[PDB]
Structure 1
Amino acid sequence: VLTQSPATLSLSPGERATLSCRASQSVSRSLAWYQQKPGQAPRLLIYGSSNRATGIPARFSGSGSGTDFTLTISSLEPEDFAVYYCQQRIHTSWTFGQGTKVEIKRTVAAPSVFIFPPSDEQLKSGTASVVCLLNNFYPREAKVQWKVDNALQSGNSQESVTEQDSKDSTYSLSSTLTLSKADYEKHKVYACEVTHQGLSSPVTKSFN
């Protein structure tokens, strides 16, 4: 029932980090914290705030009281950059918080931008996807717009962003514009404009 904050944390490895779990309801009890990596089941970090879970290094310590708790990691390692969740026992129900991810901090970098025109198979099938790829950028603040014969396109595209990688802490983004085969044929110039903190002016790549 308790909420957590900061909504997002961004720290360098070696730095101290804390995550709060705050009152929303007047439920007084000692809560426990869990860690979830992408693609994996969560693991318990502490046998409640007072005790560490077996196998968890003494970098991790939970503390607090009543309705307000903190998870403290004295020094982060790449292995700890994960989503942390809190859990209480309310009446008889098991209840989890919303959770917050701790991201690995690095410097600002513009994406490499690539445009991939639709294949012949894609067009024969009756759909003309156009794909814009942003590679190795940081932070996850990239904004991508499509332009077709200088018209601004939105609402006809979807975006998917990868998790920041473990080797370089950067993001990749794939923006797919979905046009019907007919829409692709009606228009000639396809372009995509990328805005990001690491670039001085929007980057535009295109094919026609």
Structure 2
Amino acid sequence: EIVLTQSPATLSLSPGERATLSCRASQSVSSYLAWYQQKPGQAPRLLIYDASNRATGIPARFSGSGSGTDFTLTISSLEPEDFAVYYCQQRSNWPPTFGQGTKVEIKRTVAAPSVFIFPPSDEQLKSGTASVVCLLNNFYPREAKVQWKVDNALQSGNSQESVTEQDSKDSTYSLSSTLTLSKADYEKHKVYACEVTHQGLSSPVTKSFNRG
């Protein structure tokens, strides 16, 4: 079967910039090459069919070119909504095959996180486990450090992070960090703090509460 190799694997550019994505075939597929856009949680959306043709209703900023073994998808001027994974697909030979995708991240200017902290609910405490949640809201870039402290003791191995997909309108991320304790350990301590380090902050920011 025909192997499609896409490059680059990831691409980060600001709105208004031109984006060029490549798809190379292991053997000639003539012009039998399509491009799809897939946003998080959505089905793929046909952008280009048979190398050079815009699908119905596709805006003019998307264009395709190439033939044989080399193909190019161009976004002439990126928009924040263009954050997505772009796939090429050949229909020259069975089975139809897809490339592995190029993930396009939209660069924006630096945005510091808004930090919130949530103690465990009383309902959850009547269960033996306590979850403390630290939220970093609407920040860029994606890299951030969260450190948990319980009575000023640094925690390790008892927290899990989740990061939202890049927002399609303002290109920011949000992050949750959940610290899981036993109810006994939670009731044995007083001050619960999450400390956040991020490029948008001049110095790290700590949010804390006292149990009670």
**Structure-1-length-normalised TM-score:** 0.85
Kept after mapping to 1: 8 A contact 2:80/2:171? no
Deviation at 1:54, TM superposition (A): 2.3
* Kept in 1: contact 2:80–2:170 (CA 8 A): no
Deviations 1:16-57 (A, max 9, x none): 111223467888874211011222211111112132222223
1:2–1:97 contact (8 Å) kept in structure 2: yes
Alignment check: 8 A CA contact 1:36 1:43 kept = yes
- Is contact 1:127–1:180 with CA below 8 Å preserved after alignment? yes
Q: 1:167 to 1:73 in 2, by over 3 A?
A: closer
CA distance in 1, matches of 2:189, 2:27: 56
Instruction: Tell me: CA distance 1:72–1:167, structure 2 relative to 1, closer, same or farther (3 Å).
Output: closer
Q: 1:154-173 deviations in whole A, cap 9, x for unaligned?
A: 33222121223344222111
> SS state of the match for residue 183, structure 1?
helix
Equivalent pair of 2:81/2:168 in contact (CA under 8 Å): no
Alignment coverage as a number of residue pairs = 206
Q: How much has 1:186 moved relative to structure 2?
A: 3.0
Bigger Cα displacement from structure 2, 189-198 vs 59-68: 59-68
Between 1:95-104 and 1:19-28, the stretch displaced more is: 19-28
Q: Is the 8 A contact 1:143 1:194 kept in 2?
A: yes
In structure 2, distance between residues paired with 1:154 and 1:42: 39
Q: TM-score, normalised by structure 2?
A: 0.84
The farther-off stretch of 149-158 and 134-143 is 149-158
Q: Answer yes or no: is the 8 Å Cα contact 2:147–2:155 preserved in 1.
A: yes
Structure 2 spans left out of the alignment, 5+ residues: none
* 3-state secondary structure, aligned to 1:121: helix
- Asked whether the equivalents of residues 82 and 168 of structure 2 are also in contact (C-alpha less than 8 Å), the reply is no
Q: Contact 1:29–1:67 at 8 Å: present in 2 too?
A: no
Q: Percent same amino acid at aligned positions? A: 97
Q: Is the 8 A contact 2:134 2:176 kept in 1?
A: yes
Aligned to 1:126: 128
Cα offsets for 1:81-108 (capped at 9, x unmatched):
322111124xx97622222232332211
C-alpha contact (below 8 Å) 1:12/1:104 kept by paired residues: yes
Please, which of 149, 152, 163 is the counterpart of residue 150 of structure 1? 152
